[PDB]
């Protein structure tokens, strides 16, 4: 009677307003802000910086354009199926209708978050980056600077069944990088690819068949899979941890995430041989 992923992050031995001191910024596609699951919980900023869609005859249907971001906003704070039901979210559009963005657009978005914070500070901030490109010196630098300024960043490890160190922002050490595991606590396969792995991943979290808001209708739900969904679980857990202990530094928060994670439940045989000792065998969970 509960989505498998919400049961999985609950200690083995549902918080109704968790994470209320924290604001989660989401850099993703457009969102269906009037979907009942997230209405009133997500504030759509005026920020938009996206490349044009590929194909001269592309049809911009809101239900399709909003799919990715709406589901992730639901995973973080959704009324029925969210992790941190009291967290406020602010959304920035950096991915187009096909889920594609640019490093420059993402940089301008990260700058917009810091500028917004300086103008009207609130509580601790968590920035969710459910996206990946190739290793980028500039994107890693901007992420490092925003983390050093006191902001918590969480990103997807990437869905390329590859070493996360070859992608950004996954490869930025100051960012919490999250891989995906399934209901059997095994790394997620996505077609011929799957979750990334290696020394740049901090931990794993549920990322297969995750029930969340569907932009097909105002009350619809759909299951989705990917390291974006796993990163959204960690952004929700981080919002809950920071709301309970608002004075936590980034290093202390990372220590809490590791301490409360389920340990040694992943069969390391799924990863390439040399990556087994480098990949953390941790699946995120809430504290008791």
């Amino acid at each position: 009677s509960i989505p498998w992923n919400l049961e999985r992050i609950t200690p083995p031995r549902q918080p109704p307003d968790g994470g209320s001191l924290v604001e989660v910024y989401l850099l993703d596609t457009s969102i269906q802000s009037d979907h009942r699951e997230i209405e009133g919980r997500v504030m759509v900023t005026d920020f938009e910086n996206v490349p044009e869609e590929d194909g001269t005859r592309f049809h911009r249907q809101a239900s399709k354009c909003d799919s990715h971001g709406t589901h992730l906003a639901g995973v973080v704070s959704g009324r029925d199926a969210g992790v941190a039901k009291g967290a406020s979210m602010r959304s920035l559009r950096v991915l187009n209708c096909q889920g594609k963005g640019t490093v420059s657009g993402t940089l301008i978005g990260l700058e917009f978050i810091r500028k917004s914070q300086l103008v009207q500070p609130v509580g601790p901030l968590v920035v969710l980056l459910p996206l990946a490109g190739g290793y980028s010196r500039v994107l890693n630098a901007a992420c490092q600077r925003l983390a050093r300024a006191g902001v918590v960043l969480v990103t997807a490890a990437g869905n390329f069944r590859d070493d996360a160190c070859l992608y950004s922002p996954a490869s930025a050490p100051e960012v919490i990088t999250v891989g995906a595991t399934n209901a059997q606590d095994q790394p997620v396969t996505l077609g011929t690819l799957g979750t990334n792995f290696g020394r740049c991943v901090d931990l794993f979290a549920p990322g297969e068949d995750i029930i969340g808001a569907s932009s097909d209708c105002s009350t619809c739900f759909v299951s989705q899979s990917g390291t974006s969904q796993a990163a959204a679980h960690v952004a929700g857990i981080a919002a809950m941890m920071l709301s309970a202990e608002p004075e936590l530094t980034l290093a202390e928060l990372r220590q809490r995430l590791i301490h409360f994670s389920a340990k040694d439940v992943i069969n390391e045989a799924w990863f390439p041989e040399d990556q087994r000792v480098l990949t953390p065998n941790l699946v995120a969970a809430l504290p008791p």
């Binding site: 209901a183 029930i211 209708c217 619809c220 739900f221 759909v222």
Partner: peptide, 10 residues
């Protein structure tokens, strides 16, 4: 969980 529903499945 896998699927699609017109309301919250649980």
């Amino acid at each position: 969980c896998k699927x699609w529903w017109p309301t919250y499945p649980c």
